[model samples]
Structure formats: structure tokens, C-alpha cells
Target: TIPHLAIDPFSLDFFDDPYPDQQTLRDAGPVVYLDKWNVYGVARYAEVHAVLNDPTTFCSSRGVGLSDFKKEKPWRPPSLILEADPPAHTRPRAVLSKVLSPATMKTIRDGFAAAADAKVDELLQRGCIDAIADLAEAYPLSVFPDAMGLKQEGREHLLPYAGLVFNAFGPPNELRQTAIERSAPHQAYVNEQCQRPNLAPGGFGACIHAFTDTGEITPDEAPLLVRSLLSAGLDTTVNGIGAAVYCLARFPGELQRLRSDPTLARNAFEEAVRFESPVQTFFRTTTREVELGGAVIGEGEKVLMFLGSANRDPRRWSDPDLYDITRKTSGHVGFGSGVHMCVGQLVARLEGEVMLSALARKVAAIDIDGPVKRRFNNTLRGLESLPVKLTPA
Candidate 1:
């Protein structure tokens, strides 16, 4: 018989330390049924990747959350790209593809790199700083907003809005409720900024809206597409950078390895992502009865794909728990996989590479100065406060 675990994956306990629970789930079987959530979970790398690749068999259109959009009203409008499948997913994906393409990434590369260098300089002067607030939060907030051409005021709303959106992917628990209250004003700001007039030219926001003129997408979709950027953009990169910094501090040997090579900065970031996946889980509903891991899941069943667990699955990776910068992490699903993968990934890679490179060049060592606090969100894993002492090179 397939294993059944009654554990709540969203509980604060699970969020506090997920690796043990992840191990339990993976050990139980590739697919485990949660008696509590009445959902099946895919915890191994192979099963998760297969489900992601076969989106037609395991669809996202009904809703990526446990709540089926066809059966219940969503907390907000479904994402044009994330919650959709082809042909509906095609155009929006294209628009985002173009927005974050190599050309656009090249245009912003020098600016992001320069910003990273300046931020590192500013933080290094302080000697000790909260890596989360000073480095991770500060860097993305400085660069991404202007990159989207957002107004200077009310910029604080970005993180809360993203927090709410991610939390909504799970059950309507206390976390989701708190996030809903906190994110209301921020969501309004995001909606306002998504308008064509509110967007400044030459940013991704304007670029998404420009599709309306080209007839690739209707004017109605323009704001929501920009909303997609606002939804997925800020927090993922913020947490990813935090994860990398935390990994380096925990494994100073790896940090020195990165510092020595500097060219391995990107590898450090990618390894951090694989090691501490920021966006942990996403739900995909079965379009038809599917057999997975010696069990048959009926059509319309919700299958939770644990991206974080999969990245650390021993079947696919050697020394899956080690934070080694030299490891090849290309196949990791930290940013997800298949068609629904993160469209802003290039932008994220650029941010991580630039910032890590800047630190490698300037910082000799990073030490944990105080206790690290974990931020427990429904769907995201990241540090709330990471106290660190930095030594200059």
C-alpha cells in the first residue's frame, strides 16, 4: 500500500524545519497521500519532474492551489501565465519571455551589476548587518522597482503582496488570512501601477502593456500580466539571495571557494537555490487518471509537487544536502520546471550572479553573528533575520 501521512505541510512546525518532514515524505514513497489535506504529494525528483513536464496530464488551469477555481471563487484573479495552460498560456508566456529575454537582460545587466557593487560597498562599511534586511531586501528593492518603472512611494507593498499571493496557494489558514489583510493596500498599488500610463517607458511593466498595442493580448490582459511580474518577482529573488548568503555563512569553505574563483559566483547562487529552494511547492491537478509510484490517482485529484524536496532527493543528486558551489545544479527545480517555470528566472539569475560576484570580490569571510530567524510563509522558505559579521578582503 502507498504510504499515508497525516501531517500538515503548512504547519508552523513544518515551516520551521522542513527537511525532516521532507525526508519522511520521500522515504514513505514517491507519492504519498495526506489524510489531512486529502491530497497526494510527489516528493521525489523523478515524479515531480514528470508531473511538471506532462502539464497536459497534470494541469494548472483549474487552479494551482488546493482550491479548484472551477469549484470555488479564487482569492484573486488567477495568474495569466502560472495558472494557465496552452493555448491560453502561450501569448502571456511569450510576452514575459520577451520581457526577460537575453536582450532585455543585457540592457539591464550593467545597471544591476553596478547597483550590486554599490550595495556591497555600503553594507561592508557597517561590518555587521542583517543579511536579510541590508543585503537581500535592499538590493532587489533598489533595482527591481526602477526596472519596472514603479513610483518611489508605497514601494514597501511589494513584499507583502507577494507574501499574500504565495500564501493563498495553500489552504485558507491563519497565515493566508493575515496575508490577505496585509496585502490589500499593496495589491491596490500593484493594480494601479500596472496601468499603461502609470508605467514608465523601457521597463518590463511597459513592455508587458505594449503587447496590447500589438494585438498579441487584449488590453484587459495587460495589467494582469504586469501583475504576474509584481506577484512573482520581488520575493523570490529576495529569498534566493538570502538563501545564498545563508548558505555561504553556514559553509564558509564554499564561500572561500567562490571568493577564490569569483567566476563560480553563479554556481554558488544556483547551488544555494538547489540547497534551499525558495518557492517550495506548487499544486497540479490531474487531468486524467494517472498511475504514479505504484498508485493510481483518479482524475481531478490534487497532486502537490514538492520542489524543495525534489531538489534534495538522493535519487537524483549526490550529497544532496551539502552546500557545494562546484556542483552542477542546472536540473534543479528551485525555480521550477516545464512550461510553468519562472519566466523571470533570467532576471533572478542576473541578480544572484551580480550580487554574489560583488561579495566574492570584496568580502573575505562571512560569519553568523547572532541567531537566525526563519520567516514561515505558506509557500516560501526564507530568512526573516540573518545577523552576520562580514570581513573585508
Candidate 2:
């Protein structure tokens, strides 16, 4: 029982641009089987969240990607927290949660906000700049690494490492190939950082080792837990911030609203995520036969959760396609919902809010001249370039 031709999710046309295809898939039905790949997709919001939260019926252990984890080499191993279920997933989630607790995040807020402000000031002073490279990528890369206590050397390697790791979750194709190519030289660095000795003292990586020391997890498993931070953390926030800028710029009058009230950064970033989800989709495998949207999903089959489609699913949101910051956004699935939801969303949100608030404080108006290019990958929805003029307040 298959439907269409998205066997290789990252085929050139799909990666080059995917909204039209995504829309087509969303409209097709709730659970359309991709005949070419023999996988099913839950293209609407309600179904996708249900699958992510219900780990019992939708097992993640077969691997949360197109390649059956049982058969292929994992893109990199799954994060201890991102890859596991119940007991295996619980301990590490608790350990990492302690490290990133709201109180701990609060302690870092002043410094993180300062870093964001300084970077925005630099970008604004530079006048014409690529928001992706200069501001969006620059701010988090600087603060997050320092926050994690990694040495200044080789920080640039993170972007591609993260990109490759995320794209690896999709079908093996050019998107995955391109990520590997970009990350080839720096792959060793990422591996090295996972080592106990290589992990800087007091950083999150070392914190994982602490869990190993306490026998919470085996010594061999510490790196993968820390690797999750390395793999999932950086590039996402970069593109998300860029998307936030594009959102405000596209909406025009909203920039004034944000500028007038600096706190609008929070909703702006959240709304942008609701509008253009940075992480577009993720996969889960059914543990047993299950019924969804009136369709029977067989045991051990792969199901793709289109988070982007869900975020924009018209059935869930009024004027689902419109980007409006003021709208009441209680149930948006941008950061996901339920237990398997993004663990580090607060960190990502804080980074975006800090950057956006900093820009709002300094910039009087922002407008882009050229077309904003979409960076294509099956799992991530992001803008490649945002060229613009920045007028200081």
C-alpha cells in the first residue's frame, strides 16, 4: 500500500524546493504511503504529535529515520535522550534536564543576552549583511560554545556537523551526501570532543561523563549523550533566527511592533517557528498494527511526521498560512508536543529572543532586497540567505 514518489526525500527537486510537494502531500490524505520507499507519512498536525508522544505504539528503537536502524549505519548514533524510550530515555533526560534547568538557564541569561546584543550591534553597524552568516549563526555559535566551555579553536566546524547529522535522518541522497562532504574535515573534531578527556571541565560534554562516572549510564555511552547536544544544537537556532527575521520583514508593520516592545522577540521567534518550522519532519516506526486517520498502519512500518505541515495544517489553525505574531498560539507543534518534544527548546528560544530583541532595540527598520533563498533538506525548513538593509534606530 504505497502512494507516491518521495522514496528519496532529498532528491534534487524536493530539496531544491519542497513547499509545493509538502502541500500536495498534506492534502492527499492523513496517512499516504510512499510507495517507492514503503513508508507512511502523517502529514497533518494532530496525527504527527499523536505518533511522537505515543512511544508505545510508535517505537523509535528501529530508528527514527528512513533507513531502518536495524539494518544501516546510524547517521551518527542517536542521542541518548533523543534516541531512547522510557527507562533508556528517562535517566539521561533527567541528567541533561538538571544541567539545563530553568534556573541554570536563568543564570546564563544576562551573559547570553549581552553576547546576543553585542553581535547584533556588530551586524547592525556593518550595515548591509547576510543575517544568516553574520548575526544568526554568529551569536549562538559564540555564546553556546563558551557556555559549554569548548575552546575557541574549531568552533566553525559545528554548523556542518549539525547539518550532516540532521540530514542523515532522511533517505540516503544528495542532501546527506552534501552534508557529509561539508563535514568531512571536521568530523574528527566532533568525535574527539565526545571523549572524556577531550570534554572540557564543567561543560555539558563533561557533564555526560559525570553521569557515566555515577554509573547512571555506561562509560561507552557518555559521548553519544553529549553528541546529541553537538548534533542537534547549533545550526537549527541559526536558521530559526534567520526565519524570524524573514517573518518580521515579510510582515512589514510588525517590525515597528517589535521595536516598540522589545519583549515581542519571544512571540516573534515562536510564531516564526509556528510559521516556518526549522525542523520540518522526523520519522518514527510503529511497534504494532495501529489505526490512524481511519487507515491501518502495520507493525514495524516507518511513519514520517510532517511537523511543518502540522504547524500549518488549516484544520488546526485559522488562516494557517499567515504569519502573525499577535495570534494566540497555544497549541502550535513547532517545538513539538508531549514527551518526545524537543528537550533543548528553551535554549534555542532564548537564543532567538535575545538576538531578535537586540536587533529590535537597535534597528529602526529592516528590509531585504533580493529573494530569500530556501536551504533545502527533508528534515529542516530554513532560509539559506537573507540579504538586507539595516537602518539603526
Candidate 3:
């Protein structure tokens, strides 16, 4: 028998500081039912990791949200890899994986790194730039879309559009509704751009079109695949880049360590992902009657895995709250786990590494000028803006 640990996962307070609530749930048991959202909770690291790595038991086809895929409506088709089971999910993932290989990605590395450096120089000249909006958000938005070959008309709308889509994967609340309302007009243009002969050369969009030519995937599936990248990409890196800046500001010693060894730029970003996960939580469905942490979830029940909670679970991590770039913090489920793990993680990593190195190379120091602000979205725990002061290196 399980102790009563039921709570509403949809409440605003939990979204702001889910850690306390997560601990409450984890302490309540391994798996607790959230009555208001009609889902199961697996806040502890062990159970959350188990669910992510074992998709067969907890399928992604169920839509990864409060809505059950089997019966209720899914906002859109689930991502081919993020939402599909084996066989169906395997090929598409492989196709994109080959495109994003080290060799291919390496081609753009020098160019991107230089671009990152140039941007940092520009930002410093402007002085007192909001690192999040100016550098973090600007870099990827400029490069990725150009690489995709779109006319760039709707490109400005993509990040927030993708933000809405990812957020919609949660409950159908005012947040989701607001996002849908915001994105309604540009949806057609976005959908149209996914087709062959329309995408610009050398972009990820073009690659998706090429996949159709190779007969690996249907022409029709191209938009949704591009949609997946947009949803999974943009704001994640935006928030992450901002957070890395915040980390260095708060941890002066860590910043000095990185200045001494610029290579730590990569570690700094990875550490930030581990510390303040950009994508906080995602949902999974119970395929069979499963007993998790003493709570029995019936078949088809949705489970919301608090990735932020699991990342900081004391049972799985020591000094869980501390942000240590030098720590052995690999295997943290910041990228989610198993099949649905982020496909474009390398892209995000490169963006962060290049930009961070650029900043470390130029900026002697940075500090918080005022209270750093938290940007709230239904799914992403990101920074809207962070006011900072930087000293030139």
C-alpha cells in the first residue's frame, strides 16, 4: 500500500520551484499519483532514469503529456524519434544522426566559433548587453536558419513558435492557449517551408528534403522533422547560454578556472545543463500495470518525470545543489534518456562551447548588476533577461 502523495502537477508554484515539490513527491514514494493533472510522478533519480531508459515499458507513443495518445488528442504528431517506438523511430534517427556526425558538424565548427567570437566582440563594444537576448538568442537564430535555407521571413517567429509547441506538450491551460493563439498565423508558412525545392541549400531543412529524395522518409514528414529540431533546439540553448553566464557570474572562481583553461568552456556548458536543466520535465505513459516506488500506476496512465528533480536527487548526486563545473556529473538526464534523448544535442553543445569560449577569451569578468530574472513558460524554465556587467579580458 502507498502513502497518499497526490498533488496537482499543474499548479503555478510547482512550475516556479518544482524542487521542493519534487522532494515532497519523492519522499511520498517512488511513484505518486497527481490527481489534478491525472498523471503519475517519478521524482527520484533512480525511478526517473529507469523510465526514460526503458521506453518499451513506458512508451513515448502516448504523447508525453496529460492527454493520452491512445484516446485523448495529442497537440501534434509526436516527434518521429522523441515519440516513436523502435523500428519506426530507429531509421529517422539514424538519418539525422549521420547528418550531424562529428565530421559534418566539424565542417561548421571553425566558422561558428569565429562567428561566436565576432558576436562577443560586438556585444562588448555595445557594453552592458543582455547576454541572453543579444548573444545567446542571436547566434543560433542567425546560423541555423541560414543553414536551413528558408527565406527568413518567418524565422523570427520560429523560436517562440517552437516554444509554444514544446510548451503545449503539457496541460491545456492558459499558457498553452496563449502560445497557440500567438503562433496561429505563421503555422502555414512554417508547414509550407518543409517541402522539397523550397528549402534553401546547406540548411538542416535541406537535409530533411534530401532524406525524402533518398526515399528514407516521405516528403510529407519533412516539416514535422524540421519542427522537431526547432522545438528541441532554440530556447533550450538560449536559456542554457544565459544560465552559463549566470553561473560564471555567481562562481567567480569557476570563471577564473575557465580563463586559465579555455577548454573548460565545454565543461562549463555541460555543467550548466546539469545544474539548471533548460528542459525541466517531459511525460511518459505506462504501457502496463507498473509498480514504481510503491505507487501502482494503471496501464495507459501518464507519468511526468521531473528531470530537474532527478538531476538534483540527493540519492543520485552528492552536493546536488552546488554548481560545480569540475564535478563528475556525466549521465545526468538533462538530455532526457534512451531513444527520445535529444538528437540535436551536439548542435546545442557546439553553440554553447563556441560562444562561451568567445566570451572567456574576451571578457575578463562579469557580475550580476541586478536580480537575474526567470522567464516562465509551460515547459521550459529559461531566462527572459539577465542584467550583467562585463569586464574586458
Candidate 4:
């Protein structure tokens, strides 16, 4: 018999503080039947990695949420790349992969680095700032919209829309409901911005639409593909920045280590992802009956993979909870593994690298000045308010 736990991973308390419950889930067994949601879960690093890498047996085409697309209407149009499997996922994935390639990131690198420097200069001048609002959210909003060629007027909607998308991945609870209620206008705005004529000539959005000339994707598909970037791009980086700030503030030693070698900027960012995992959990359905951890899960079963848990699993890392910048952070699931891995991660790294490197060069230390408030979403983990004071070098 499979080990069963009656834990509601979506409860308000769980969302507020999940570490204890994540440990509970991980300790219960490798594969536990979540009696509350009637879903199977794999919390260990090994099993979670296997499930993510083997997309054929555990597919994403049906949907990556608890609400299977075959049975219910998706709150929004499904992401062409994120919610599709190989054959349907191929072109968009290839197109986006090329669009966000290392060379592409290099083209925008100096501009992004300069933007980071400017933002940091402003924040440091203030002496004290809400790290989440003034730094994390502001930096991304300032740069990403312009890169996407979105009109400045409706740019405020980007973060909320991304938050709503992540929240909708769970059961229809208050969090998901509230996000849905507050997101309609924002969602509509995003849909409008994804269109071709509204996009700037040399921006990522227009570049994605360029694929249509070669018949890579349809004109209709162009907006939807751009929607993929608008959806996944901002919040991940914002929370990643938030997480890095939180980590550096909490572990001043690690911040000093980073300061000593500003070159560790990329490592610092990747380390923060491993530590806080901006995206905590995602669901994948089993395509057929399969055995995981000696238990046979039935066909079409929803299996929740705790990516945050996997990142912290002691089985995978020597000192799993410590925020260490020097650790080799490869194979971490902060970005999901295999075919559906985060397409925007390179962009996120660039954002993280430039901003953190700027901070390391100019800021002497970061100290938490007031209470920290966390933003709770079913799928995303981050701060809503992180009050911090920075000391200039």
C-alpha cells in the first residue's frame, strides 16, 4: 500500500510557511498519496528529477496544473510552449531557445548591466528601501517591458498577471480565486500587447512574430508565443532577486563572500534559486500506470513535484539549508529539468547577475531593517515586502 498523508498543500497556513510541511512531505515516503488533493507526490530529489526528465511517461501536454485540461476549462489560453508536449512544443521551443541564446543575451548584456547600475544608484541613495518593491520588482518592470516592446501605459499589469498565472496552477481556493478576480484587466492588457502592430520593431516580441515569415508558426500563434514570454519572464526574475536579497541579508557572510569576488555574481544568483526556489511546486500527470518508489501509480494521476523540496533535499546536497555561494549548483531543479525547463532562465540569470554584481561593487552590506512579508502563491515563492537598509562600499 502507498503511504498516504492528508496534507492540503494549498492551505493558507501552508502557503505562509511551507518548510515544515515540505519536510513532512519529504519524510513521509518517496511517493505519498495526498489524501486531501487525491494526488500522488514525489518530494525527494532523485524521484522528482527522474519524473521531470522523463516527459513521455509524465507528460505536460494535458496541462501542468491540478485541473486537467481534458476535464476543465483553463482560466487563460494555455502557453504554447509550456503546456504542450514535444511535437506541438518543438517549434516554439526551438524558436524561443534561439531567441534567448547566449549570443542574444550578450547583445542585451551591457544595457541590462547599465540599467542595474542605475537602479542600484537610485536605491542606495535612498539608504533604506523595500528590497522587493524598490529593487526586485522595479528593476524587472523597468527593463523587461521595454525589451518586450510593450507600451509603457499598461506595464503595471505584468507582475500581477504573472502572479495570477502561477496561482492558477493549484486547486480553486481563495488564493487562486482572488488572483483570478484581480487579474482580468491585466490579462486582457497582456493579450493586447502580444499583438504584432503594438510591438516595437527590434524587441523580443517582434522577433518572435518574425518566425511567421518563415512559416515557423501562424500569425495567430505569434501572439500566444509572445504571451509565453510575458507570462513566465517577469515574476520569476523578481522573486529570484527577492530571494537573493533575502538570502544575502540573512547570511551576511555569503554576501561578503560575493563582495570579495564580484565575479561570483552568477553563482550567487544560481545559489539563491537553489536556496529559495522561486517556483515551489508544479504538477505533472502520469501518462500511464507507472511505479515510483516501489508504488504503482495509476494512469492519468496527478503527481505534484515539490521542486523547492527537491532543491533542499539533504540527499542531494551536503549542507542543504545553508546559503552558500561556492557550492556547485548544477542539476538543481530551481529551474525545472528536461524538455520543459525554464526557457527564460538565461534572461533571469542575466538580470540577477548584472544587478547583484552591481550591488557587490557598490554596496558594502545589506541588513534587514524591518519585518519581511511574503507573497503567497500556489506555485511561486517570494517576498511582497522586504525592508532592507544598504551600506555603501
* lDDT ranking from best candidate downward: 1, 4, 2, 3
Better of 1 and 3 by TM-score: 1
Whole-model Cα lDDT per candidate?
Answer: 0.92, 0.79, 0.79, 0.91
The CA lDDT at 349 in model 2 is 84
Candidate 3 Cα outliers beyond 4 Å, as residue runs: 213-215
- The clash numbers for all candidates, in the given order, read 0, 0, 4, 0
Model 4 C-alpha lDDT per residue in residues 26-88, reported as the tens digit of each score? 888899999888899988999999999989899897789898887888888888998898889
Q: Candidate 1's residue-wise lDDT over 1-393, tens digit each?
A: 778898899999999989999999998997899998899999999999999999898999988888888788888888889989988999889888998899999999999999999999998899999999999999999999999988888898898889889999988889988887777788889889989998889999998887787667889999999999989999999999999999999999999899999999998999999999999997999989989878999998999989999999999999999999999898999988889888999999999999999999999999999999999888999999999999999
* TM-scores of the candidates in the order shown: 0.98, 0.94, 0.95, 0.98
lDDT of 4 at 353: 96
For model 4, where is the 10-residue window of minimal lDDT? 210-219
- The digit string of per-residue lDDT tens for model 2 on 1-393 reads 435655344566765666677778878877888776678988787788788789988877778778777777776656677767787887777777776779768878898899988887887778888877777777888888876767778887888788777787887767777776677666788888778887778776777687776656788987777778888778888878888888877887888888889888888889998888888877888888999888998887889888888888887889988888777877888887777677788888889888888978998888897777777765877777888888899
Model 3: residue 292 alpha-carbon error in angstroms:
2.3
Clashing pairs in 1: none
Q: Model 3: per-residue lDDT, tens digit, 1-393? A: 654564655557766677788779878878776766767778889999999988887998777766777897666666777778877888788777766668768877888888888888887887787767786688877677765667867777777777787678778887777887787655666667767667777777777767876666787777778766666767788878887888888888888888888988998898888888888887888889987766677888788898888899999999988888777878898888888787788888998899889977898888777666677777787777777778898
Candidates 1 and 3, the one with greater lDDT: 1
Off by over 4 Å in 1: none
Clashing pairs in 3: 147-203, 148-203, 149-200, 364-393
TM-score computed on alpha carbons, candidate 2: 0.94
